[PDB]
Backbone:
């Protein structure tokens, strides 16, 4: 697939995440081989202080299916996800991502996604994540982000490909702990 023949140089994507309560996030990744190396800059704005994200009232994302397609000449990927709240309600969020693979089609292409937090330390300092991407090695990760004016940096280590297949990560907050927002808004950007 487009991410397989893009290496050993690497590819990149820009991701927009529009939440229901006005909060919006934009994240860019630059993936390269050295082992897979990931450098991501994350930023979210206008998350309500009484909302679920800034008050940590979320408990992981539900299973989802991203649809990939061709736009102008670009490879795009639409999907609307539902974040499950601590309370029984749901918290919707739209994902509009642009995959800028180096190898710059006619039909559609769907990818099922499943992300869960298997276990995590209190305050989500050390977190273990499980990612699952299905069509129809080692991975070093580093994220420097800022959410609602609070900067932070997350480092991680994991196994598996970062575009498809099964992937497990062991993340740890190095600068910015403790995070004052729901960690679930970052698990997708990884």
Residues:
């Amino acid at each position: 697939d487009y991410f397989k023949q893009s290496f050993p140089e690497g590819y990149s994507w820009e991701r927009s995440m529009t939440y229901e309560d006005g909060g919006i996030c934009i994240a860019t990744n630059d993936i390269t081989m050295e082992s897979f190396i990931n450098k991501i800059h994350f930023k979210g704005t206008n998350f309500p202080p009484n909302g679920p994200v800034m008050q940590k009232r979320t408990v992981g994302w539900e299973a989802s299916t991203e649809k990939m397609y061709e736009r102008d000449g670009v490879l795009k990927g639409d999907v609307k996800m539902k974040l499950l709240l601590k309370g029984g309600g749901h918290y919707r969020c739209d994902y509009r991502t642009t995959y800028k693979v180096k190898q710059k089609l006619p039909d559609y292409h769907f990818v099922d996604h499943r992300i869960e937090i298997l276990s995590h330390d209190k305050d989500y300092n050390k977190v273990k994540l499980y990612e699952h991407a299905v069509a129809r090695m080692k991975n070093k990760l580093r994220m420097e982000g800022n959410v609602n004016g609070h900067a932070f940096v997350i480092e991680g280590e994991g196994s598996g490909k970062p575009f498809e297949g099964i992937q497990t990560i062991d993340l740890e907050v190095k600068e910015g702990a403790p995070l004052p927002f729901a960690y679930d808004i970052l698990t997708t950007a990884f």
